[PDB]
């Protein structure tokens, strides 16, 4: 299946696959220490991962890949997905990050953790960028799907078949995005322009994830990347 | 200024801005040759930048910032372009074609090499054209350090996004004249722009790889950049 859908079926399939908004532990001794805050954020991210995989498996064409490739895609994209999710729910809160409804953090508190405020500022500018573009929910949900499939599709006859499949679904998601823009009343020109502006944003988000990884590795954190087994286990 | 140009005038201007292909100063250390080569490519990269439609409409500090963020990506998409027609190899210079096996001589590099070779295959499979390539490089210059507060800064970011809108039209136009449908047009546009994300990934991996060894400084200096822009 997965290539039969209309654009409208694609949006709906993606909208219902959407993960829930999770909460931080309701037990914080606010104000924070650098360790307490990294503890709450880490705990949150760990719980978001399980819903992320479940979401991934409901993304059109994702379960058609081999389990090994599914793991590979998730290995590359997991932090990017976290980040575009974070910036999305932070849109209506300028100068703040909404990790959880009970964990809205301003810029000054990011500076509690060494080097995080640098990572923090990139995230805010991106949220602001989404706000100025008036990014819509269907567009976001599409952009997130693109990140999942694209971040690792740069890695046999089987192997080329899996990649052309991935590129087939991505062209469909591209079709879906254009369709959404057409019914909004944008011209052929505004359609190509807006599509471009959205994808150029993914480039920066890739940069943010890259910086984020170094920051996490810089806090000498315990076991940053999810491991092949944990990803494989959660996928079954 | 540049917001007035047609797609074909945009392409023509960018094709004429293209830097020369430089040579490795070889013999008849490998990091020595590559470092030396990259250093000489930088001056022409700046000359190229100043001739990209709308780059000189910006302030010098803003030009420096863009070049500060994009320089390694530009080097890399340049390398991948001239390596396209040489499978399993990357052409740093006409007298310096290297396989993965020779990249594996230098520590931690074989990973970056594989990423770069992978980009070449992708360009090759897409039949990426010189005109498209030349458009993609300009986008890298303008887009990589745009996300970064006076009224002037706001005008700067609006100009950059207007010029970026222009190259999108330019890219779409090229695809139309090649005979692709409207649907094939936005698909290829998407495919090209999504590749830029990977190049950003390579660029960051590249920096970490460069810091893992020595340099005088890895990032070019603000003054030198401001100096080179003259
Ligand atoms: C973007 C983001 C981060 C993050 C990003 C960059 C940083 O420098 C710091 C935090 N954080 C906090 C954070 C991000 C990543 C973390 O990795 C910790 C370990 N877990 C990864 C999921 C589990 C198996 C692997 C290890 C731990 C905490 C988020 C939490 C929720 C969320 O929606 C978004 C984020
Ligand atoms: C892709 C690529 C590399 C490269 C270097 C290190 C890696 O780990 C992977 C690829 N290199 C070699 C190289 C690239 C960048 C380098 O940066 C450090 C040295 N001088 C760098 C530039 C600003 C002025 C000061 C620093 C040093 C070596 C290329 C050279 C030319 C070229 O067209 C492409 C490349």
The DSSP-derived string for B163-179 is: HHHHHHHHHHHHHHHTT
- For the CA atoms of A119, A122, A126, A129, what is the dihedral angle to 10 degrees? 160
Closest listed residue to residue B198, CA positions, set B104, B102, B117? B117
Ligand 2 binding residues, C-beta < 6 A: B 34-35, 37-39, 41-42, 75-76, 78-79, 92, 109, 112, 116, 206, 209-210, 215, 218, 220
Tokens 């980009």 sit at which residue? B119
Spatial separation of the C-alpha atoms in residues B210 and B217, rounded to whole Å:
10
Three-state secondary structure call for residue A106:
strand
**Are B204 and A207 inside 8 Å of each other by CB?**
yes
B145–chain A nearest CA distance, Å: 9
User: Which residues 6+ apart lie within 8 Å of B223 measured at CB?
Assistant: none
Q: Which stretches of B19-91 are DSSP H helices?
A: 30-49, 60-81
Write the residues followed by a gap in chain B (C–N more than 2.5 A): 28, 148
Q: How far is the CA of A25 from the centre of ligand 2 (A)?
A: 46
∠ CA B173-B177-B181 to the nearest 5 degrees?
A: 85
CATH number for A40: 1.10.565.10
| Interface contact A233, partner B, CB < 8 A | no
**Are B193 and A174 inside 8 Å of each other by CB?**
no
Three-state secondary structure call for residue A221:
coil
∠ CA B217-B219-B223 to the nearest 5 degrees?
A: 90
For residue A172, give its domain range. 1-236
**Are A200 and B139 inside 8 Å of each other by CB?**
yes
| Interface contact B12, partner A, CB < 8 A | no
Closest listed residue to residue A53, CA positions, set A67, A41, A38? A67
Q: Rg of the Cα trace of chain B?
A: 18
- For the CA atoms of A95, A101, A102, A105, what is the dihedral angle to 10 degrees? -20
Spatial separation of the C-alpha atoms in residues A31 and A52, rounded to whole Å:
29
**Are A151 and B197 inside 8 Å of each other by CB?**
yes
**Are B204 and A192 inside 8 Å of each other by CB?**
no
A154–chain B nearest CA distance, Å: 7
∠ CA A198-A199-A202 to the nearest 5 degrees?
A: 100
Ligand 1 binding residues, C-beta < 6 A: A 41-42, 44-46, 48-49, 82-83, 85-86, 99, 116, 119, 212, 215-216, 223-224, 226
| Chain B partners within 8 Å of A203 (Cβ) | 143-144, 193, 196-197, 200
| Interface contact A133, partner B, CB < 8 A | no
Spatial separation of the C-alpha atoms in residues A150 and A58, rounded to whole Å:
16
* Domains contained in chain B, number: 1
**Are B115 and A154 inside 8 Å of each other by CB?**
yes
Q: How far is the CA of B35 from the centre of ligand 2 (A)?
A: 6
Cis omega (within 30 of 0) for bond into A33: no
Closest listed residue to residue B105, CA positions, set B40, B201, B22, B32? B32
| Interface contact A38, partner B, CB < 8 A | no
| Interface contact A197, partner B, CB < 8 A | yes
User: Euclidean distance between the first and final Cα of chain A, in Å?
Assistant: 21
Which residue out of B190, B192, B193, B195 would a mutagenesis test of the A interface target, given it has the greatest number of A Cβ atoms within 10 Å? B190
| Chain A partners within 8 Å of B122 (Cβ) | 154
B29–chain A nearest CA distance, Å: 29
Three-state secondary structure call for residue B141:
helix
Record the resolution, in angstroms. Answer: 2.5
Structure obtained using:
X-ray
Closest listed residue to residue A96, CA positions, set A87, A106, A86? A106
User: Euclidean distance between the first and final Cα of chain B, in Å?
Assistant: 21
Q: How far is the CA of B142 from the centre of ligand 2 (A)?
A: 20
| Interface contact B177, partner A, CB < 8 A | no
State the ligand closest to the CA atom of A103.
1
| Interface contact B139, partner A, CB < 8 A | yes
- b/e map A52-71, b = 16+ CB within 10 Å: bbebbeebbbbebbeeebbb
| Chain A partners within 8 Å of B201 (Cβ) | 206, 210
CB A169 within 8 A of CB A60: yes
Task: Name the pairing type of β-strands A104-106 and A96-98.
Answer: antiparallel
């Amino acid at each position: 299946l997965a290539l039969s859908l209309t654009a409208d079926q694609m949006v709906s399939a993606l909208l219902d696959a959407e993960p829930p908004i999770l909460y931080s532990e309701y037990d914080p001794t606010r104000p924070f220490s650098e360790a307490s805050m990294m503890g709450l954020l880490t705990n949150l991210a760990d719980r978001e991962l399980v819903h992320m995989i479940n979401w991934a498996k409901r993304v059109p064409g994702f379960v058609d890949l081999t389990s090994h490739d599914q793991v590979h895609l998730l290995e590359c994209a997991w932090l990017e997905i976290l980040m575009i999710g974070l910036v999305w729910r932070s849109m209506e809160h300028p100068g703040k990050l909404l990790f959880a409804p009970n964990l809205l953090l301003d810029r000054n508190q990011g500076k509690c953790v060494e080097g995080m405020v640098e990572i923090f500022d990139m995230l805010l500018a991106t949220s602001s960028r989404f706000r100025m573009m008036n990014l819509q929910g269907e567009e976001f949900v599409c952009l997130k799907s693109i990140i999942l499939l694209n971040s690792g599709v740069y890695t046999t006859l089987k192997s080329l078949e899996e990649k052309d499949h991935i590129h087939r679904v991505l062209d469909k998601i591209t079709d879906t995005l254009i369709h959404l823009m057409a019914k909004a009343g944008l011209t052929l020109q505004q359609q190509h322009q807006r599509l471009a502006q959205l994808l150029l944003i993914l480039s920066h988000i890739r940069h943010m994830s890259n910086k984020g990884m170094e920051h996490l590795y810089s806090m000498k954190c315990k076991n940053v990347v999810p491991s092949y087994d944990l990803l494989l286990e959660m996928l079954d």
